[PDB]
Amino acid sequence: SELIEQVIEQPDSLIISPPSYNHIQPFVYLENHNVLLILNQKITIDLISLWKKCEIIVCADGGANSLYEYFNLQRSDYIPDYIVGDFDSISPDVKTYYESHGSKIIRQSSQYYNDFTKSIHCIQLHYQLNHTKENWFESIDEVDGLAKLWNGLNNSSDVVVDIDITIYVLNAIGGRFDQTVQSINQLYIMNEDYPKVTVFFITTNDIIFLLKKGVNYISYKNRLMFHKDSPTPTCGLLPLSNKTPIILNSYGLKYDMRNWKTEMLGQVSSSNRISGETGFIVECSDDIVMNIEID
Amino acid sequence: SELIEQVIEQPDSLIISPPSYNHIQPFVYLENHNVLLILNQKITIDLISLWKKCEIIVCADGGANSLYEYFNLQRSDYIPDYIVGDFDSISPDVKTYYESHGSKIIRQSSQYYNDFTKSIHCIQLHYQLNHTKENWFESIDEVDGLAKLWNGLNNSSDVVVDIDITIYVLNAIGGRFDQTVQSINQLYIMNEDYPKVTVFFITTNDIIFLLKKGVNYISYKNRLMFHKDSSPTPTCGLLPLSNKTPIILNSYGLKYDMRNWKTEMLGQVSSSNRISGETGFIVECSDDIVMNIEID
Ligand SMILES: Cc1ncc(C[n+]2csc(CCO)c2C)c(N)n1
Ligand SMILES: Cc1ncc(C[n+]2csc(CCO)c2C)c(N)n1
Ligand SMILES: [Mg+2]
Ligand SMILES: [Mg+2]
Ligand SMILES: [Mg+2]
Ligand SMILES: [Mg+2]
């Protein structure tokens, strides 16, 4: 708390050279094992382009409707590998359609896990058991079998801890606020327990991800890739965990921070902008969420 | 930390008697110095009904476009009292329109406060100086005059700490994520600094407000006022988004009632909960905590 906090107003363009540090490339999809997780909300992004870059696609219940309604390109060319959840939102017509086309249906009635977490368990269990059994999900407990199987396969130590996964999550932010918060909560929890799983929330307004404790280097070919020709893209660093405060040091943002303490009920960097033409750096005393405006 | 955490599954309908405690009535606007603050996003709700119940209406920059574009039955009958911000989003056409109709224009170029906080300062200063001077905002510092004039006077001098205000904020949630978080951050900050100011974020999906440390009693005529007759009961969540953690919760009237239940980010968080109380419910918390309730 001794070091003086600083906020440096930088020029609109700067060249930041690469800094062990955490390297983040949020916009590769706009050019590891890629996964597309589709939650329940209208799909506005270029679904097709994202789909083509993913190994598996999972729909979280109502998310299947969102996928279905997007084509009304041939709908039959994009069948989700898995459809997971309590199914209190997916419509029979949509359910029938995809089931007849081969989607692996996994019903989980548990009222203690949401469609997002259930879908996440499905994804993790997939990369652990699918190469062994195509129907690994069959006959499992219909209440919370995924949850039990996941955090239970670790007791037998049959879990491959080494596998880099990138999960692109659609429709998880922006809707009901408690769902947005649970999604962020899971983002933090998942990094704590599964640091090799990288999650990107792609929304209508921005891309949201997690900066890891320590140095983070975020790169991209150029800002034009995600910001059509404001002259510069906006961003924010959001201290939403139970670890507070967070000490930030950035290099490449319009309002660069040095030994700047951030915390909810304190100062929070919002409406910041990106000056780095090819990348920027953010060092943090603990994991922290970052959002970057897209288009 | 010793008491056992409990989650009690309750029937879909329960009768909760009132509890000394914080009484919250989030839906009276569907059923007091009311203020309507409009940020920049398309207006989906029944604007006119809310406007009618508000004493003052403020547009945060682009929020003026949102108000203007809403009438695309007479736009001229709804002129905002103030239009505040750096004005990078408001369009000249809209700006000229309301200007000519008497809206009080308060430009603040400061790049260290957003349109929301600037609008909040304007609202607080209004209830302090407006009754004494109609054009109190004139000639103030155009960079951060509102910010300096407020807290710079919020010190035992002219301020009148006794003033109950209810601010209804539109378009503050659901847009760019950093704006959503800054809004929630301010929600927390405002309560500790200005406890008599009650804020309600009205979004396309729910109403969001703050539960105060201690006992909270949320009441309404019936769940029908905010939940049209797939799901029989309205959804809700208790979100621990402050730097005070963990929060111990004790609820009476939710579908999944909590007892001695510790909530925190990176821990367990109550989401997709539901309201069983027919006329209200109780939530006791060890510290302020955010609550959202589905509106449909
Ligand atoms: C670390 C840091 N983050 C953001 C801002 C300023 N930012 C916050 S509000 C606003 C104006 C919005 O109309 C801007 C540009 C800063 N100064 N320092
Ligand atoms: C305190 C508390 N809050 C929420 C839930 C359960 N809730 C969380 S996920 C889910 C199912 C969503 O499809 C439900 C109902 C609980 N059990 N206890
Ligand atoms: Mg569901
Ligand atoms: Mg579920
Ligand atoms: Mg503005
Ligand atoms: Mg501003």
Residue numbers in the entry:
A (entry chain A): 5 to 23, 30 to 41, 49 to 89, 100 to 256, 260 to 325
B (entry chain B): 5 to 23, 30 to 41, 49 to 89, 100 to 256, 259 to 325
Paper text:
The production of thiamine pyrophosphate (TPP), catalyzed by TPK, is critical for both catabolic and anabolic cellular processes. In yeast, this thiamine phosphate is then hydrolyzed into thiamine before pyrophosphorylation by the TPK that catalyzes the transfer of a pyrophosphate (PPi) from ATP to thiamine, resulting in AMP and TPP. CA1462 is a homodimer, with each monomer constituted of two domains.
The strong electronic density is consistent with thiamine molecules present at the thiamine binding site. The thiamine ammonium group N4 of the amidopyrimidine ring is engaged in a salt bridge with the Q138A main-chain carbonyl oxygen. The opposite side of this ring is stabilized by another salt bridge involving N1 and the oxygen from the S299B side chain. As observed in the mouse TPK/TPP complex, an Mg2+ ion is maintained by electrostatic interactions with the side chain of the four strictly conserved aspartate residues (D78, D113A, D115, D142). Interestingly, the C. albicans TPK/thiamine complex reveals a second Mg2+ partially stabilized by the hydroxyl group O1 of thiamine and a salt bridge with D113 and D142 side chains and with two main chain carboxy oxygens (Y140, N141). The nitrogen atom from the K145 side chain participates in the last coordination (Mg2+ number 2). As proposed by Timm et al., this lysine could be involved in the activation of the thiamine hydroxyl by the stabilization of a water molecule or, as in this C. albicans structure, of a magnesium ion. In the C. albicans thiamine complex, 2 water molecules take the place of oxygen atoms from the proximal thiamine phosphate. The equivalent glutamine (Q206A) adopts the same conformation in the C. albicans TPK/thiamine complex and an opened conformation in the C. albicans TPK/TPNP complex. The structure containing thiamine only exhibits the closed conformation, while both are present in the TPK/TPNP complex.
